[PDB]
Amino acid sequence: MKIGVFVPIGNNGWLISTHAPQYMPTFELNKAIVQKAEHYHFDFALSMIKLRGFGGKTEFWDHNLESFTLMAGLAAVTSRIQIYATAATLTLPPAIVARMAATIDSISGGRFGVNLVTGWQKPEYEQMGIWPGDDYFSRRYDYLTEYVQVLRDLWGTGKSDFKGDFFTMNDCRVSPQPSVPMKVICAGQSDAGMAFSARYADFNFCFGKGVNTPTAFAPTAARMKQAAEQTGRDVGSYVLFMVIADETDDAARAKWEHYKAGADEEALSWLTDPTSAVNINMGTLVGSYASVARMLDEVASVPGAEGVLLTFDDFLSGIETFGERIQPLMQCRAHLP
Numbered sequence: 001m002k003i004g005v006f007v008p009i010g011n012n013g014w015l016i017s018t019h020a021p022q023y024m025p026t027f028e029l030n031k032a033i034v035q036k037a038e039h040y041h042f043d044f045a046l047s048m049i050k051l052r053g054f055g056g057k058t059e060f061w062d063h064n065l066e067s068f069t070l071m072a073g074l075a076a077v078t079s080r081i082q083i084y085a086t087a088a089t090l091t092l093p094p095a096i097v098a099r100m101a102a103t104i105d106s107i108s109g110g111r112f113g114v115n116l117v118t119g120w121q122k123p124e125y126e127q128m129g130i131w132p133g134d135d136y137f138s139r140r141y142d143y144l145t146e147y148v149q150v151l152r153d154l155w156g157t158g159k160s161d162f163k164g165d166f167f168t169m170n171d172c173r174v175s176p177q178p179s180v181p182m183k184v185i186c187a188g189q190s191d192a193g194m195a196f197s198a199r200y201a202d203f204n205f206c207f208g209k210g211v212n213t214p215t216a217f218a219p220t221a222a223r224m225k226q227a228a229e230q231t232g233r234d235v236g237s238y239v240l241f242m243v244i245a246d247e248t249d250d251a252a253r254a255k256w257e258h259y260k261a262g263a264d265e266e267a268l269s270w271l272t273d274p275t276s277a278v279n280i281n282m283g284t285l286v287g288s289y290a291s292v293a294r295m296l297d298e299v300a301s302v303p304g305a306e307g308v309l310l311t312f313d314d315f316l317s318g319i320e321t322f323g324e325r326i327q328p329l330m331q332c333r334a335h336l337p
């Protein structure tokens with residue numbers, strides 16, 4: 001199974017708690033994280049794009065870097081890990097994304113790909129006057145289909161004459177073309193989103209589910225395999241989890257409970273053994289290094305699951321303990337050096 005790191009482009013990562021680590025997203029922090037992930041043979045690093053935060057005591061996601069420029073900088077200081085940026089497709093013309101992708105292909109020597117998102121949180125767009133209206137909720141994958149057609153023309157041939165409802169290309173040109181086939185990834189959970197992914201993506205990201213129920217996402221990965229059957233394309237599932245690991249199950253549980261006890265309720269308001277809002281009800285693996293290794297090996301056995309995208313409570317120590325204590329016990333990582 002492949003392992004990626006979801007890099008903290010927003011302050012405080014994925015914990016909405018006064019008891020969680022408090023930190024700003026800097027370049028040098030994301031550089032340290034990605035160089036340590038690459039050292040431990042992580043396969044990829046992805047950044048999201050988040051254009052508005054949730055406030056509260058922790059100013060949660062009020063502070064966020066931009067994904068293409070962050071990943072261009074990270075590409076320059078790495079050599080092997082795959083680098084993915086997220087395009088909020090309402091915010092960038094497709095010929096600009098095409099050229100940014102060819103640029104980071106150049107920086108990285110062919111390690112770059114794009115996560116294409118529709119956007120769904122109206123305020124991120126309404127705040128800058130570019131929300132297309134509430135018809136977007138139902139038509140957004142029609143928009144994304146035209147967007148990706150323009151991208152595939154430009155990457156594949158260097159030109160597009162595409163004409164649709166949303167885009168008009170009149171001999172649009174982007175060269176250079178990427179040195180390797182450009183990877184497109186999607187994070188579609190809906191039927192329309194999975195249908196898009198099945199037609200155009202290399203793989204689809206989905207949410208891990210529950211606390212210490214690693215296989216609870218299986219129905220989502222089954223729906224995505226069904227969507228991929230309809231195109232005949234091999235489009236696997238990469239599943240998002242948070243890992244809270246320690247020397248013992250009891251020690252990891254104590255950390256998780258300490259984070260939940262600090263929940264930043266004002267920030268959680270704006271956003272509105274169970275999952276907790278403290279990490280946006282993310283799929284969570286809480287245990288000893290050995291327990292987390294066993295639970296990740298169970299993820300690897302789910303039909304359609306090809307990888308995991310990981311967040312941690314503390315990225316610098318969480319990547320280190322992952323590489324030193326968890327990954328060496330994982331049957332699904334026995335292929336590493």
Ligand SMILES: Cc1cc2nc3c(=O)[nH]c(=O)nc-3n(C[C@H](O)[C@H](O)[C@H](O)COP(=O)(O)O)c2cc1C
Binds near residue numbers: 049050119191205207
């Ligand atoms: C790993 C992951 C990363 C995501 N990143 C973003 C992002 O950066 N920006 C964004 O607007 N939406 C993001 N999303 C939301 C998805 O693109 C998508 O809208 C959501 O999964 C709901 O599916 P649907 O679009 O098919 O309803 C992400 C989802 C997942 C699972």
